[PDB]
Structure 1
Amino acid sequence: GGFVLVHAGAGYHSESKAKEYKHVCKRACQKAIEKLQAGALATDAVTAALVELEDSPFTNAGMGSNLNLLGEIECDASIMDGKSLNFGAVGALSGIKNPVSVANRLLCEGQKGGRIPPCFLVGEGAYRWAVDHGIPSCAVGAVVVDHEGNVAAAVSSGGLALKHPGRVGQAALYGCGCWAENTGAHNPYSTAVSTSGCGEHLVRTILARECSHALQAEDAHQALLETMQNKFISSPFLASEDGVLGGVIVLRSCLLVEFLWSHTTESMCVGYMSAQDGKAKTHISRLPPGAVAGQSVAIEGGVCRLE
């Protein structure tokens, strides 16, 4: 009972590291499905996927993250639960092995509930909070749907290479890095979204939420393509860019699960797996023949039936 879709990042293609990206995606899916079969929450299953993705020294998230301008690792990560709509996030976080675990814990403590617990912490404060909650001290994304139709999403990143210290990207921002929202009065489908690419491009277009909105339309493939074209590549908010670089993985369910991935970057490695079927599928998505990176859109999808 369950389905997962993950990505190891959207960016330059690597005919040498592609094998590494596909393997971690395979392992990440395995982790997520195993959690679901253990009867774990969708948030816990998406978190497990991200931990595996972060741990790969080949991914720009967690260990192996791009060093910033000071030669330090500063991580961004967030997670959202479709059932409760709660969210957890950390930005510019250093000294913590798995940034996504901190985000997940923040979301969980959020459930507990006068004063509303913090949903977004940065820097030292985020580090202090993590240690205070027993989280081990020392880009990638996933969307999941459990056997009950609940959806969750998460994203983790090391941010731009040599970025100025304190520079925060889309992986830490609400509505930008990921989105998870179960079916509701004005939300026909339970949708989950996770993004990757130039943080600035994804933030200014609030891409994750935008994709989720678009996905409430009848045709998911047309809906996502129009979003990537009009609300991203041709977005007036990115008129200041010479090429828009980003990728997304999406899941929509009602269990009938439709999943897609789309990117404007040269490539994007994805992986997916269905619980009642096993066997993780991986794929390096690349832009069509003679296409233009930052100017065109690659898009693919599939469907999963959860009995």
Structure 2
Amino acid sequence: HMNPIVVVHGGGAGPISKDRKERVHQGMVRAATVGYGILREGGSAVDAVEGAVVALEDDPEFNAGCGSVLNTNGEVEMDASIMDGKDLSAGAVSAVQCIANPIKLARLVMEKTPHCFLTDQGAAQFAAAMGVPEIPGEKLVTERNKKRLEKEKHTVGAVALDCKGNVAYATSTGGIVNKMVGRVGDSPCLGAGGYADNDIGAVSTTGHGESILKVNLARLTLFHIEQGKTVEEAADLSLGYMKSRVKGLGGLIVVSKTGDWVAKWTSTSMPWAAAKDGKLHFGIDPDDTTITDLP
């Protein structure tokens, strides 16, 4: 049986407030442990990535679910995708409003529809039909995101490997601040915001969404892994190509089917945490990584 692992991220970005680092760090910690606790029971890779991401959606320090950034209209529209590495089954939603957990809906699309990707109004209709509570549009909006929008008006994810050796990813976001209405980035798009294949590995992405789409970052990262590269080498190859070809910056987390894993980025920062073998790992800035025992 495979030594299970979960990696998590809370979004590529620039410099982060030191005080905020503590809310983010604890955010990372709680999502990774949630993830590892679901795996602990011998739970599935899909379960673990879904659970990890639900936690980060509910945590207002991260741009997904509650605390999602605001579009040009000062409003929240969310993107999500989830993928099962066994049969490449996938679920995705784009442009969804006034709901707690985009990733759960994405999982609802994967499991309770013959499709893989629902959008905007039909995603809203699907949500209702599945008994997803509509939560007030103001409970997702925070004051710090309001001050983010005003200045400009003048993403979370997880990968897992379960005890049976399956891999999965989950990525969730409110997008980029001051985005057009109905803008869809890479997060809900298979191959871009993440990919998962048992014959290679699983990936969740973050960074400049258009650029991530343009280069199909998640799959590319795996193209390099098939071709015999280490998880690190491949991550640097893929992010380096996104920087070199289209001048976009980003980050990613990845676990291979051998359970070798890495977080690597070309944004200034990328909060990440991984749980493997009863230890929790954490980082924000490159070459600055701490490790603690995980009960």
Q: Give TM class, smaller chain.
A: 0.7 to 0.9
Aligned length: 267
Q: Greater share of helix residues, 1 or 2?
A: 2
Q: Could you tell me which residue of structure 2 aligns to residue 244 of structure 1?
A: 248
Q: Could you tell me which residue of structure 2 aligns to residue 137 of structure 1?
A: 134
Equivalent position to 1:155, from 171, 176, 179 = 171
Distance 2:265 2:279 in 1: 25
- Written as runs of structure 1 = structure 2, the 5 A alignment for 1:1-307 is 2-14=4-16, 15-110=18-113, 117-138=114-135, 139-183=155-199, 190-220=200-230, 221-229=232-240, 231-235=241-245, 238=246, 243-254=247-258, 257-274=259-276, 277-286=277-286
Distance 1:132 1:83 in 2: 28
Distance 1:130 1:39 in 2: 29
- 3-state SS of 1:11 partner: coil
Identity %: 37
- Residues 230-289 of structure 1, C-alpha deviations (whole Å, 9 max, x = no match): x21112xx2xxxx422111111123xx111122111110100002xx323221112489x
TM-score, length of structure 2 as denominator length: 0.86
- Residues 108-158 of structure 1, C-alpha deviations (whole Å, 9 max, x = no match): 225xxxxxx121111121011012112233210100000011000010011
Distance 1:130 1:3 in 2: 31
The 8 Å contact of residues 235 and 252 in structure 2, kept in 1 or not, is answered as: no
TM-score, length of structure 1 as denominator length: 0.83
The 8 Å contact of residues 63 and 156 in structure 2, kept in 1 or not, is answered as: yes
Distance 2:211 2:262 in 1: 20
- Residues 69-91 of structure 1, C-alpha deviations (whole Å, 9 max, x = no match): 11110000101110121110000
- Residues 216-236 of structure 1, C-alpha deviations (whole Å, 9 max, x = no match): 13231323322222x21112x
Distance 2:56 2:227 in 1: 31
The 8 Å contact of residues 221 and 237 in structure 2, kept in 1 or not, is answered as: no
Gaps (5+ residues) in structure 2?
A: 136-154
The 8 Å contact of residues 100 and 155 in structure 1, kept in 2 or not, is answered as: yes
The 8 Å contact of residues 217 and 223 in structure 1, kept in 2 or not, is answered as: no
Q: 1:223 to 1:245 in 2, by over 3 A?
A: closer
The 8 Å contact of residues 177 and 208 in structure 1, kept in 2 or not, is answered as: yes
The 8 Å contact of residues 239 and 249 in structure 2, kept in 1 or not, is answered as: no
User: What residue identity is the alignment partner of 1:102?
Assistant: L
Q: Could you tell me which residue of structure 1 aligns to residue 148 of structure 2?
A: none
Q: Greater share of strand residues, 1 or 2?
A: 1
Deviation at 1:42, TM superposition (A): 1.4
Distance 1:67 1:225 in 2: 31
